[PDB]
């Protein structure tokens, strides 16, 4: 079933660098900022979404925290579709 | 050809499947959250020390009708049977 696969291969990425070292649970936003740019490299905001895009990227960037979990590291993935996918261009 | 770009299309493409149906493309009611988990997880099941979380998880959808279940939200909860049913975060605080 593909939503399966697609759900395993989420917690895959993650497992590979949240196990890098320390807790296995957790990134560093750091981190949660490499995976976004090298597992999503192909991603770019739609027409009303540069600027939602650019200020959630600046804010990994900026942010060095390490307490992102699964959850929200989930949820990063939620703000790109909303960004970058075209079936949210007109979403409110 | 990137494993998770294809995995986080398929999360849109079954999202697209549900919410296209009828009403407001950008939203599902939670009926219709909890008919995708049950069909398109069919086969996830949780961990040792989740089942208590996960049949509440599972409670709550079925009971609570409220058809604002918007795209983060539906992540949301497949997030969370991730935590409920992923041996990965079995020991997961």
């Known amino acids: ?11 895959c990425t993650f ?12 990134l560093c936003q750091a ?5 976004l ?17 650019n ?5 990994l960037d900026t942010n060095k925290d390490c307490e992102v979990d699964f959850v929200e590291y989930v949820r990063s993935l939620a703000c ?3 960004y970058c996918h075209e079936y949210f ?3 409110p």
């Not at 497992?15 to 957790?26: N, T, V």
Request: charged share 35%; proline share 4%; with cysteine.
């Open 1 to 11: 079933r593909p939503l399966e696969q697609a759900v395993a291969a989420i917690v």
């Open 15 to 26: 497992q590979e660098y949240a196990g890098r070292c320390g807790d296995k649970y957790k």
């Open 31 to 35: 981190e949660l900022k490499e995976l």
């Open 37 to 53: 740019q090298k597992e999503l490299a192909t991603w770019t905001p739609t027409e009303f979404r540069e600027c939602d895009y």
């Open 55 to 59: 200020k959630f990227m600046s804010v």
């Open 80 to 82: 790109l579709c909303l």
């Open 89 to 91: 261009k007109d979403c």
